[PDB]
Amino acid sequence: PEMVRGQVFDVGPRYTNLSYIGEGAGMVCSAYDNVNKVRVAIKKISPFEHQTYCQRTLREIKILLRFRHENIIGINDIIRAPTIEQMKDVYIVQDLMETDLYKLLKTQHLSNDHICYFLYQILRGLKYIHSANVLHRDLKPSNLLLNTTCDLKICDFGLARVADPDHDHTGFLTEYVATRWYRAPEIMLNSKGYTKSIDIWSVGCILAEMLSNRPIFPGKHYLDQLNHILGILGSPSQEDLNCIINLKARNYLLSLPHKNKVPWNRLFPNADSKALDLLDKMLTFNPHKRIEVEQALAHPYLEQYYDPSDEPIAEAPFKFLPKEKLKELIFEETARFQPG
Secondary structure, three states, rough: OOOOOOOOOOOOOOOEEEEEEEEEOOEEEEEEOOOOOOOOEEEEEEOOHHHHHHHHHHHOOOOOEEEEOOEOOOEEEEEOOOOOOOOOOOEEEEEEOOOOOOHHHHOOOOHHHHHHHHHHHHHHHHHHHHHHHEEEOOHHHEEEOOOOOOOEEEEOOOOOEEEHHHOOOOOOOOOOOOOOOOOOHHHHEEEOOOOOHHHHHHHHHHHHHHHHHHOOOOOOOOHHHHHHHHHHHOOOOHHHHHHHHHHHHHHHHHOOOOOOOOHHHHHOOOOOOOHHHHHHHHHOOOOOOOOOHHHHOHHHHHHHOOOOHOOOOOOOOOOOOOOOHHHHHHHOHHHHHHOO
């Protein structure tokens, strides 16, 4: 059994020369693949004690194995014990990606051509995810992986769900799991984050962050996230308020001092005007009025890239429980990788 930091990282004999990386979810390391002759990334997952983490591990593995797209991280291999009883960890092998958009934005100015290109690839991947009736629900720069030629792949489907717009309504101040700064305004008001518009918001936030290297709405707590949003978009219109039937959420918005829109061209003076037109459409307060992924692809900003015949959709969309049974399902889901 190979060791890294005095812990089992048991992956051989296909994957040799381990270098440590981090502590993502369990721990992460790189390694040399001996069948394909490329180095790879390997995540150790240990979820069998908790039914919640079984559900998340199973959801991510099921989704990633269903999906096949250039702009979504694939699972190359899964390593685990030959029996349920001996299975204590799972190792997920993926393409080694030299960096991510979070890291890149910490030290690199992005040219307008890079921003355009990254945005295109994000939306191309998202078109596919949405076409499978899946919501990612945690899009943010650290979940966008990049290699040295700037190919981009969406990762981390741990919070992803099958779309469920008929059951999206909730009361005011409902607790939310996904990363605060990329949460759409409606999450804090009346939304469980079960519609596609939740992801387009996050993409809008990422576009803004790409332009300035700084998060656009860095809220310090749950309702501060909404005050950051309204300080730029301005107070919602009566029409957009009329769409919020929940009284607590409506009265909260009514209680706030009036705030006027900050023009995008003042926040981002060096930005391409077409980039700002698209940004405005993704960062729209009203989720029903917010641009759809396909409309965003078709926007003049992306005209150099847009090619719907080369923007594939999912062949097999996702149409629609104790940890003991989920361990069996994870074991089952990962069976295809066993020597055979």
